[PDB]
Design an enzyme around this catalytic site. Sequence first.
Site, short mmCIF file in Angstrom:
data_model
loop_
_atom_site.label_atom_id
_atom_site.label_comp_id
_atom_site.label_asym_id
_atom_site.label_seq_id
_atom_site.Cartn_x
_atom_site.Cartn_y
_atom_site.Cartn_z
N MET A 112 -35.14 15.35 17.29
CA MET A 112 -35.29 14.12 18.00
C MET A 112 -35.27 12.88 17.71
O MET A 112 -35.81 11.94 18.24
CB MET A 112 -35.95 14.26 18.95
CG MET A 112 -35.02 15.69 20.10
SD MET A 112 -36.57 16.17 21.00
CE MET A 112 -37.75 16.54 20.22
N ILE A 131 -40.51 8.12 21.52
CA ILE A 131 -41.41 8.00 20.95
C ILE A 131 -41.81 6.91 20.34
O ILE A 131 -42.63 6.19 19.90
CB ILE A 131 -41.93 8.95 20.11
CG1 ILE A 131 -43.65 8.94 19.27
CG2 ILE A 131 -40.55 9.57 18.71
CD1 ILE A 131 -43.46 10.19 18.44
N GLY A 132 -39.77 6.17 20.04
CA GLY A 132 -39.79 4.81 19.60
C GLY A 132 -38.51 4.50 20.74
O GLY A 132 -38.20 3.22 19.54
N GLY A 133 -37.70 4.85 21.01
CA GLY A 133 -37.43 3.77 21.97
C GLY A 133 -35.73 5.16 22.84
O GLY A 133 -35.06 4.83 23.22
C1 LIG Z 1 -36.97 8.71 20.23
O1 LIG Z 1 -38.30 7.90 20.98
C2 LIG Z 1 -37.02 7.94 18.74
C3 LIG Z 1 -36.11 7.05 18.74
C4 LIG Z 1 -35.73 6.43 17.14
C5 LIG Z 1 -36.56 6.05 16.16
C6 LIG Z 1 -37.13 6.12 14.94
C7 LIG Z 1 -38.49 4.60 14.72
C8 LIG Z 1 -38.52 5.34 13.20
C9 LIG Z 1 -37.59 5.66 12.28
C10 LIG Z 1 -37.98 6.15 10.82
C11 LIG Z 1 -39.48 5.11 10.21
C12 LIG Z 1 -39.97 4.48 11.78
C13 LIG Z 1 -39.67 4.70 12.77
C14 LIG Z 1 -37.76 9.71 20.36
N1 LIG Z 1 -38.43 10.75 19.37
C15 LIG Z 1 -38.74 12.04 19.53
C16 LIG Z 1 -39.32 13.08 19.05
C17 LIG Z 1 -38.91 13.32 17.54
C18 LIG Z 1 -39.64 14.40 17.41
C19 LIG Z 1 -40.70 15.20 17.97
C20 LIG Z 1 -40.37 14.60 19.29
N2 LIG Z 1 -40.33 13.73 19.66
C21 LIG Z 1 -38.96 12.00 21.65
O2 LIG Z 1 -38.13 10.40 21.40
#
Ligand SMILES: *[C@](O)(CCCCCCc1ccccc1)c1nc(-c2ccccn2)co1
Lengths: 544, 543
Positions: free
Chosen positions: B158, B205-207
Amino acid sequence: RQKARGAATRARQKQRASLETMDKAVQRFRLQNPDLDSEALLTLPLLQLVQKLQSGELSPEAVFFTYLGKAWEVNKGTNCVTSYLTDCETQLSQAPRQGLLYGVPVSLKECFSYKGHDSTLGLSLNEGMPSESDCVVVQVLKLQGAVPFVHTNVPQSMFSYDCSNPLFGQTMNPWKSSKSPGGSSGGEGALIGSGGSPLGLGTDIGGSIRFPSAFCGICGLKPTGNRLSKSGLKGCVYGQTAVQLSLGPMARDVESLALCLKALLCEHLFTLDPTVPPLPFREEVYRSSRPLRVGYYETDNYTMPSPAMRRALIETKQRLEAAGHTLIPFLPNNIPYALEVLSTGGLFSDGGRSFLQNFKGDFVDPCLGDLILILRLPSWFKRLLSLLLKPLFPRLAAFLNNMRPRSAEKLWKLQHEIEMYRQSVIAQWKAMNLDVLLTPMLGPALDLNTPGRATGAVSYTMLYNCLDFPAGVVPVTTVTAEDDAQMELYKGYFGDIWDIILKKAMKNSVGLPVAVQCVALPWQEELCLRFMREVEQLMTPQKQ
Amino acid sequence: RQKARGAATRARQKQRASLETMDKAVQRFRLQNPDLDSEALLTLPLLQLVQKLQSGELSPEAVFFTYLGKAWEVNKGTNCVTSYLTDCETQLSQAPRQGLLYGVPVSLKECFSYKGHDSTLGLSLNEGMPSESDCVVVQVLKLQGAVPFVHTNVPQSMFSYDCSNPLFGQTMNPWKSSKSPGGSSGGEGALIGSGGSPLGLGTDIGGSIRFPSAFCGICGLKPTGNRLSKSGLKGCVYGQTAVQLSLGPMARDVESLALCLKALLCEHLFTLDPTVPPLPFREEVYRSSRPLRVGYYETDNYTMPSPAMRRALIETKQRLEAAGHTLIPFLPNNIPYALEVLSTGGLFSDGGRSFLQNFKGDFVDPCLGDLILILRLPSWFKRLLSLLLKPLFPRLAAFLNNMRPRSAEKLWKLQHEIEMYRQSVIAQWKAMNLDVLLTPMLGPALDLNTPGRATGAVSYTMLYNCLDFPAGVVPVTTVTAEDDAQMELYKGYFGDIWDIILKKAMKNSVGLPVAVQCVALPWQEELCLRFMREVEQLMTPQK
Ligand SMILES: *[C@](O)(CCCCCCc1ccccc1)c1nc(-c2ccccn2)co1
Ligand SMILES: *[C@](O)(CCCCCCc1ccccc1)c1nc(-c2ccccn2)co1
Ligand SMILES: [Cl-]
């Protein structure tokens, strides 16, 4: 120690000048107002005081100066006041008339930052470092018309359930000079317990609202940690989120606590600190008079209760059953694990290094016992000493092992374990369909400088900091000759130094107050208060 | 990789059988109901669909089987559905009539635990490990009369804004097959985006709610982390509390998001998970039509916006001003520090070790790029590489340095910095007396397998995960030929690999949707929704 000595000299000078300023202000008021009945004013319950302020039957000036005079007087025997908040005579004149706390003098634990005043925490490093602004809860109190008037004493660093520091010295229990007032909100407990303030604010990470409330015979509530704003509070460990700090009221009766919460939980608070969930006070829940399902335990099987504690719990249980409540045996699972691994580990994940920074170049108050010496031990030695103690003194072994430094990886693991633990106790609670829980509360007050050598006795309170459930205490009885005599037969469940010190510390307590603790689920402060109100009504009916 | 291959085989078999079961159920309903007008039912906005269900004008059976048929159809071109939730035909019959979502079919990101079903996350270690019970939000959905019907695809682990894993494969954007649907709530975005579900739940968690909502041309809201219960959700990192996960609704319009939040924020939720503050949905705030003070920025000075992104933001600003709102230039302080030190550090405090446990014995999906390789590097090498890159590629150097393992002492220091940072941005906000904030949102959709190689582009979204403010996205425009052509002139602020990849990835996007982001203070979901509602009404009327 030159810096630390100079700091103590300056702090003592500042305290002395404050108390002088208080005295002069009180005498001035008294010269211009010879006909005021002080003793009647001081004995009014807070809710009656407020209605008289709200009706103009009493002036805020009369109320403030009468309490100022009482505070100054009771301080002579307790040393509970560190600073007079100075500007409070101009807040007095500017207090919003429609404020829920209009005209009410309020005492503040020293950590509640107040513009122009130090929040030393008894640490030399914080002396001569005055706050640039009022913390958010102070701001709200003032917007509600309250007049914060004094900073009250705390044990050095605040991480202690005694109440001494090298700057301002030792606070004493108002009931007995040889006894601790509790703490870390000890100054509040001593002042409120003596009649010197109608309402105070404390903080709590392992029992620091509840110990002073119990030991001094007053009521206090530790809310869910994020029910009220901690913005602008002075602390000494930064970024520790496993076991969060909570702030809340202390007062002479339960209604006063409800009024305080109601006043604080206002739009001013929620706009000044957007990070607090905007949960208004639910009066209907607080005012409910329906029967409750009440879980209870007589012992947590970790700290043997004193005879007075056990009697206090059993009598309260009996009175609640007589009143129509359903009393259900209940004990949270895995208390030793929760206290030894989750709570101790959460508080000391870094092995104490962050905490110890505060004491560099400072005196260590005797009231902290050997905590600083133990925290300073190398991790390998903590581990080795742990292994040697384990077979004879497993409690001591477990605290030592769990006060070692660790990686962020292992902290994550601990934080997950705390989360799962909270859900496990919530699951037990729902399975028995509990509304609230009744537990013993430590006391009677321990002798001065023994809390720091009886660390195991935090078990009754620290459990609900680990779980982050609201928890309050209500005085229900006083120690009898029999209760006190029977302390001779106290052995403890472990027979380690903590049990031995606690046996001795709780002796010589005839006439001292003893409480029980009232717990509800997270965010259920109003239900907690509804249950505290019930206990108060049944056990001490004239408090009403 | 024998275990992993076997797991992929068994998951593919289960998916195939699920889709077969759906088809058979759809055909049965259609045999017994030949005269139903499906296209009209499917194009009803959710609020009208709900009123018809509530009035008995449409049966829940008709609604469910029409959408199931549509889900099955659109899955042919998208690969968004991993599992049919099977028992849902019995929930359908038991759905409480007075429920706010009575008869509404709901799609669920695969991590929303559902009794008897795996929540694999694309990881072999989670295959063949069915959940013993529904998570709390699924329980509440059901108590409000909703019928959860499908689990939707996610990228492996995810932690990615693409949407492929070794078990169920690659999900495609419904607008263009060569494009990513976004993610990690990508299957939701693809399904809702193509008309296959009226309402879904994602996590972020990041978008991960906002990327798929933007790339697929739908609406989504990431609430304050603890507004809704995460109890029973499947995850893969445990105990990381610096940067909190948030769960929330995705739908075709903003009113759908408001209804979902309203239905969720009920006594059932608050009793099932006592750790969630019992804050009911404030309809008066959501329904407010007062002028707003709207902070805005055109760029975060970290990810250069695409021409479409910039035009989307400027036109929205202009319409808001025309409508009487006050537009105030505003930019959160120290964004690079928030992203590089606070967010990356918070997510990878342990150097990735906890995260990497999930991939032991497994294949690593190409959509993850080189994230697993870099996380596996020794701390000393991350440090050295960081120093070497710093003078030329300071962005890349900062991410590397901050993905190193550290002590609990240092994590405390980081968690305190996060807390102070949040308070610094709240202080800026109050100083300008803002009600809400308007920002660009990444897009148009990136090409498949490029999100993993354009990590810098999460800047627009991840900032409000770090700050834990509610943030949502609303589609406002589509890429024009000019917008797309001007991507040739895109340089980025850094000129590192992430800028270069992003330039290529966003090409070939004419006709694709583009969104803006709407932000409010913590616990102000209703205000956020009130503002999203305004944007949607001004930019997309008929919606
Ligand atoms: C999404 O929000 C994930 C979006 C991708 C963000 C990547 C950010 C990043 C990459 C590399 C280095 C630093 C920052 C999301 N992820 C989850 C999740 C992921 C894992 C476990 C549980 N939840 C949920 O939503
Ligand atoms: C009080 O709750 C502290 C009560 C004392 C509990 C000690 C628990 C313990 C001791 C030794 C080993 C393991 C556990 C309190 N403390 C604070 C405080 C302290 C320091 C910084 C900020 N707040 C507030 O209230
Ligand atoms: Cl919270």
